[PDB]
Amino acid sequence: RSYLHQELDRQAENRFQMAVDEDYYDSIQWTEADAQVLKERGQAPLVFN
Amino acid sequence: RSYLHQELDRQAENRFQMAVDEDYYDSIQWTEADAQVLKERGQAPLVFN
Amino acid sequence: PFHRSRSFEDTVKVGLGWIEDSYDDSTDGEPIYSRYESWRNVIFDSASTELDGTDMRYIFRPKWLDVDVACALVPDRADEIKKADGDEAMDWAEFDRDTYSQSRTVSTHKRQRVRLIECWYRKPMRATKTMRVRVAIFTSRDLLFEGASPFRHNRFSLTPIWGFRRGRDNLPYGVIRWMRDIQDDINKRASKALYILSSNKVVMDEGAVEDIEEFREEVARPDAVLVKKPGKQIELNVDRELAAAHMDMMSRDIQMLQQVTVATNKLFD
Amino acid sequence: ELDGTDMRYIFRPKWLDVDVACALVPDRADEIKKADGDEAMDWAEFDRDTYSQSRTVSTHKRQRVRLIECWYRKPMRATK
Amino acid sequence: SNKVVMDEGAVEDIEEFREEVARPDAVLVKKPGKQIELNVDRELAAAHM
Amino acid sequence: KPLDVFMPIIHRFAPGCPEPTAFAAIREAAIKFCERTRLWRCDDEFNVGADECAEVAVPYGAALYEMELVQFNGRNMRPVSTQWLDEQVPDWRTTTQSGQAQYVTQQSEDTLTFVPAEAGSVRVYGLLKPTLDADSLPDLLADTYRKTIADGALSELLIIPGKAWMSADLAVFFGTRFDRELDRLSTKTIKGQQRAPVRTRAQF
Amino acid sequence: KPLDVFMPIIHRFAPGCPEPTAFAAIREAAIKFCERTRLWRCDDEFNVGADECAEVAVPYGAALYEMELVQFNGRNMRPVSTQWLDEQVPDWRTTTQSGQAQYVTQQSEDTLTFVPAEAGSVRVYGLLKPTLDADSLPDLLADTYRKTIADGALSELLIIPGKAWMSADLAVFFGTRFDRELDRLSTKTIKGQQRAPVRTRAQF
Numbered sequence: 001r002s003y004l005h006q007e008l009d010r011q012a013e014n015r016f017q018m019a020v021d022e023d024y025y026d027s028i029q030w031t032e033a034d035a036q037v038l039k040e041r042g043q044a045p046l047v048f049n
Numbered sequence: 050r051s052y053l054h055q056e057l058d059r060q061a062e063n064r065f066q067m068a069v070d071e072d073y074y075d076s077i078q079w080t081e082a083d084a085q086v087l088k089e090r091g092q093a094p095l096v097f098n
Numbered sequence: 099p100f101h102r103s104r105s106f107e108d109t110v111k112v113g114l115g116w117i118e119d120s121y122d123d124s125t126d127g128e129p130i131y132s133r134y135e136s137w138r139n140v141i142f143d144s145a146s147t148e149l150d151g152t153d154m155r156y157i158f159r160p161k162w163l164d165v166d167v168a169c170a171l172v173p174d175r176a177d178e179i180k181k182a183d184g185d186e187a188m189d190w191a192e193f194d195r196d197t198y199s200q201s202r203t204v205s206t207h208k209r210q211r212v213r214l215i216e217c218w219y220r221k222p223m224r225a226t227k228t229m230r231v232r233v234a235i236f237t238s239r240d241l242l243f244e245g246a247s248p249f250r251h252n253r254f255s256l257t258p259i260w261g262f263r264r265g266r267d268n269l270p271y272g273v274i275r276w277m278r279d280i281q282d283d284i285n286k287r288a289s290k291a292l293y294i295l296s297s298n299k300v301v302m303d304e305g306a307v308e309d310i311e312e313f314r315e316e317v318a319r320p321d322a323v324l325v326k327k328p329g330k331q332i333e334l335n336v337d338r339e340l341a342a343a344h345m346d347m348m349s350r351d352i353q354m355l356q357q358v359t360v361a362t363n364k365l366f367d
Numbered sequence: 368e369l370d371g372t373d374m375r376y377i378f379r380p381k382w383l384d385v386d387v388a389c390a391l392v393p394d395r396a397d398e399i400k401k402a403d404g405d406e407a408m409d410w411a412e413f414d415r416d417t418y419s420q421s422r423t424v425s426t427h428k429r430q431r432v433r434l435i436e437c438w439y440r441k442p443m444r445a446t447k
Numbered sequence: 448s449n450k451v452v453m454d455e456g457a458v459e460d461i462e463e464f465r466e467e468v469a470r471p472d473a474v475l476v477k478k479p480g481k482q483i484e485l486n487v488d489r490e491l492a493a494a495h496m
Numbered sequence: 497k498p499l500d501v502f503m504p505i506i507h508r509f510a511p512g513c514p515e516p517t518a519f520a521a522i523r524e525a526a527i528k529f530c531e532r533t534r535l536w537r538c539d540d541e542f543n544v545g546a547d548e549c550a551e552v553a554v555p556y557g558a559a560l561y562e563m564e565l566v567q568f569n570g571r572n573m574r575p576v577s578t579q580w581l582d583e584q585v586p587d588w589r590t591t592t593q594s595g596q597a598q599y600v601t602q603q604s605e606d607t608l609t610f611v612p613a614e615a616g617s618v619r620v621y622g623l624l625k626p627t628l629d630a631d632s633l634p635d636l637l638a639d640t641y642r643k644t645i646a647d648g649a650l651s652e653l654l655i656i657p658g659k660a661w662m663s664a665d666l667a668v669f670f671g672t673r674f675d676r677e678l679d680r681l682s683t684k685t686i687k688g689q690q691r692a693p694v695r696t697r698a699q700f
Numbered sequence: 701k702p703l704d705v706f707m708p709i710i711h712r713f714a715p716g717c718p719e720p721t722a723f724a725a726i727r728e729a730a731i732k733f734c735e736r737t738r739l740w741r742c743d744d745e746f747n748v749g750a751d752e753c754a755e756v757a758v759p760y761g762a763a764l765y766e767m768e769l770v771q772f773n774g775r776n777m778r779p780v781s782t783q784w785l786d787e788q789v790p791d792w793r794t795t796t797q798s799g800q801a802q803y804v805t806q807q808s809e810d811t812l813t814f815v816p817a818e819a820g821s822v823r824v825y826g827l828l829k830p831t832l833d834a835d836s837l838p839d840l841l842a843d844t845y846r847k848t849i850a851d852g853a854l855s856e857l858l859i860i861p862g863k864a865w866m867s868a869d870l871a872v873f874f875g876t877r878f879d880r881e882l883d884r885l886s887t888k889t890i891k892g893q894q895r896a897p898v899r900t901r902a903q904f
Contacts, residue, residue, distance in 0.1 A: 001236075003156060003158075004141065004158050004183075004215065004217075005183070007141045007142075007143065007144070007158060008141060008183070008184070008185050010144055011141065011144065011185070011269070012185065012186075014113065014264075014267075014269045014270075014271065015185050015186075015187060016186065017271065017275070018111075018112035018113050018137060018271070018272060019112075019138075019186070019187050020278075021111060021112055021271075021272050021274040021275065021278060022111050022112055024274065024278050024281065024282075025111050025274070029281060029282060029285055030285070034286075038289060040788070041293055041297075041472075041698060042296075042697070042698050042699075042700060043289065043292060043293055043296070043698065043700060044700070045289070046285070046288060046289065046292075047285060048281070048284055048285060048288060049281070051205040051206075051207040051208075052207070052209070052376060052378075052437075053378050053403075053435065053437070054205070054403065055198060055204075055208075055209070056376075056378065057403065057404070057405050058198050058199050058202060059195065059198045059199075060405075061199070061405065064405050064406070064407060065406065068406065068407050089584065090321075100369060101369060104369060125445060125447070133368075134369060164375065166441065166442055167442055170442035170443075170444050173444075286904055290471075290904065292700075293471050293472070293698065294471045296698040296699060296700050297471055297472040297696050297697070297698030297699075298472075298696060299470070299471050299472060299473055299475075299696070300473075300474050300475065300696060301475040301476075301477060301483060301485070302474070302475070302476060302477070303476075303477065303479050304459075304476050304477060304478055304479065304679050304680065304682075305479075305675075305679040305682070306476075308532070310474070310682060310683055310685065310686060310694070311685060311686060311783060313474075314474060314686070314694060314695070314696055314697065315697050317696045317697070318696065318697055318698055318699035319699055320699075330479070336475075336485065337449070337471070337485065337486065340471075343492065350496065448900055448901075448902035448903070449900055450900070451900060455883045455884060455886065455887075456879075456882075456883035456886060459680060459736075459886075460691075460738075461886060461887055461889070461890055461898065462691070462889065462890065463687075463691065463693060465890065465898060465899070465900055465901060466693065466901045467693055467694075467695075467901075468900045468901070469900060469901055469902055469903035470693075470695065470903055471903075472695045472696040472697075472698055473693065473694070473695055473696070474694040474695065474696055476683065501832075504724070505724075508721060508724070508860065509859070509860065509861070511862070535809065537807060537808070539793075564782075564783075565786055567793075567794070570791065570794050572786065572790050572791075619793075619794075621793075635809070636808075636809040639763070639831075639832070640763055640809065642832050643728050643731070643832075660862075663861050665868065666859060666861055669859065685781075686781045686783065687781070688779075688781065688805075688806040689764060689765065689766050689767050689806055689809075689810075689826070690766075690767050690770070690779035690804055690805070690806050690812075691766060691767065691768070691779055692779045692780050692781040692784070692805075694781075697787075
């Protein structure tokens with residue numbers, strides 16, 4: 001369990017990066033904060049992908 | 050019945066998205082609110098599809 | 099071949115993919131099973147420097163299973179399974195499945211899912227006459243079974259299909275990263291250009307308009323009638339060549355994505 | 368699973384007429400006679416049932432009932 | 448971002464000006480006899496590209 | 497609150513003006529100020545029902561300049577012009593059917609009409625304008641912006657002919673100052689004292 | 701602090717003017733100075749709760765000209781106009797549900813409203829403006845910037861007709877100098893005495 005915890009907390013940066021990469025693959029490319037910024041503009045967010 | 054309810058409400062978002070996709074396929078691409086806005090404009094809505 | 103194709107597809111999108119070839123006993127007819135494991139569900143030792151993966155000391159495989167399946171999987175220890183961490187990826191998937199909806203009235207009958215972690219570790223032996231693989235399956239609070247690897251080959255079943263591997267920290271990354279940041283820049287450029295098209299920026303003489311609220315609301319409307327004072331100039335359409343500039347910037351970023359078979363050869367190798 | 372064996376259950380809600388549903392399964396016609404779903408299939412069926420916004424529906428009306436076929440997997444733990 | 452060269456009394460509140468110049472939707476007010484020159488240098492963007 | 501706080505400025509520039517005439521000039525200048533600045537605001541609640549063209553209720557020494565926002569029984573209503581209804585919604589005047597109120601039209605000076613008539617509470621959020629005969633101006637005009645309304649009133653008082661108070665140069669100077677101060681304060685509705693930014697609405 | 705330091709300049713350029721008139725002109729000129737320069741700042745704290753439109757407490761010889769920012773229980777709070785809330789956040793006034801504050805609106809002249817009502821400490825960091833009747837002007841207006849306020853007041857006095865003080869040439873000249881000095885000092889809020897740079901916010 002200690003080894004698994006060390007592996008998880010050491011890999012967390014690159015695992016999160018790979019998760020975000022897989023998320024950008026399927027046309028999900030807007031950060032929540034920037035999506036809110038666009039929403040306040042009245043502009044619908046778009047992804048060119 | 051409980052399993053069916055869980056599977057139905059768990060996939061509700063994707064079910065709605067697929068329904069909207071199939072709806073977009075056969076030349077219905079206008080939101081009802083935007084269609085009303087165009088109607089007040091005096092403009093007939095059009096879809097290029 | 100479908101498993102290998104999916105595995106390489108994942109090695110393209112993300113850093114690495116795992117294909118496992120092992121021997122299992124069950125009512126399933128095929129004894130030697132070769133199946134894909136996602137990059138999410140595998141935790142691998144990062145101290146390894148060998149390309150083969152021999153220096154990989156231990157591999158952890160967190161799997162999410164139903165209680166009935168998990169109890170049926172290993173006998174003689176059903177009580178511990180009944181009574182019973184992870185990264186945000188697989189935990190997020192499982193918790194999204196458990197959540198169903200934001201606010202939901204879950205009935206009494208709820209499917210119960212438990213986490214089993216299968217660990218393969220290597221320990222030196224130095225027989226008098228060296229590395230012996232041992233399988234370790236453990237839940238959150240206890241281990242279900244501990245034993246040596248029955249297979250003659252002294253390596254873990256899971257083989258990682260590598261990709262672009264970072265030089266400094268020796269951790270894989272997918273094809274995406276550079277395309278990723280140029281893509282988010284392209285999205286920002288497109289959104290900015292569309293906004294600039296939609297909404298006019300107005301710099302005016304201080305006494306241009308009598309009613310500033312109606313003016314503010316109806317600048318963009320193509321049918322609006324604007325009432326202005328005689329000698330107080332209104333400058334509408336202040337900065338709109340920015341639209342063409344941002345469109346050109348997006349096109350240039352597309353061209354740079356084009357620039358950035360032979361280049362991809364390392365993934366195929 | 369790419370294979371799909373890990374799929375524990377599948378549900379097939381079918382919309383059937385009372386006559387045909389009664390014919391398909393015998394010895395339990397009373398339960399069918401006295402007889403959830405997502406927006407898609409129920410929307411189609413209710414659009415069929417609605418006809419128009421305001422109509423004078425006659426006494427004779429097609430009665431449609433929903434039957435759900437559930438294929439589920441349970442481990443057996445055969446000693447063999 | 449815009450660069451601004453202006454007379455001293457071009458704008459009454461320089462803080463709202465400072466924040467809202469870059470905004471594509473902002474309403475900017477200036478005094479009559481004081482000129483405003485937004486976009487002082489912008490061919491430099493083409494030069495740098 | 498009373499105009500005697502406005503009086504010292506006038507008697508400093510116009511030495512011997514009668515108080516009633518100065519009062520009238522101050523009230524008219526404040527009318528112009530509230531017409532341009534639109535700062536003064538108030539809320540009222542009243543019941544409207546059964547095709548009743550109800551009138552707004554405002555403080556006695558004031559008049560309703562403009563309706564910033566109208567709410568029917570908790571609904572943010574959309575104001576429309578009468579010709580807009582005649583185009584989009586036929587039989588507005590002929591019909592008597594009651595329904596959920598959706599647009600407001602002001603046929604008369606101070607009476608608001610809803611194209612669907614209903615019996616429900618109406619909350620009006622409207623800018624105020626001092627009446628031509630108000631003994632006491634509201635606190636915001638007198639306490640904080642005394643000088644501007646004083647400038648307008650002094651312009652009007654210096655306009656008066658055939659009197660020792662007549663001076664074209666000072667009248668023009670005070671009129672220009674009043675115009676400039678009104679012009680600077682014109683944005684206070686959207687801005688306020690909170691520095692809220694003014695941003696154009698975008699239409700897609 | 702007292703106006704007796706300002707008044708000698710008025711003596712020099714407007715010979716032997718009565719003290720109350722010169723003092724009133726000092727107050728008006730300093731008001732315009734603070735409206736333009738915005739250099740006076742003070743920090744105020746009060747407790748706001750239970751849908752109360754609390755008023756900002758200010759020193760006796762001052763008025764809250766403009767709020768640089770508001771902090772709500774340690775939260776940097778965002779000011780928006782009332783129409784912005786009406787158009788994004790509906791049922792703004794009707795709703796009584798409590799929550800953590802997110803938007804500030806100044807519906808009245810000195811009252812602050814937060815779109816979620818909550819009972820907590822509110823700190824208002826805002827610019828100040830001298831009141832129309834202040835015995836003592838602040839230190840910044842008196843000690844270091846006496847000459848600009850003096851020029852504005854001299855314009856005000858020299859406008860006065862039918863007196864030995866009246867001189868249109870000097871009135872125009874001092875008005876121009878006052879405008880130019882205010883105009884130069886307009887940037888002193890951002891720059892300060894520390895030469896802080898003025899840099900346009902960049903939007904991508």
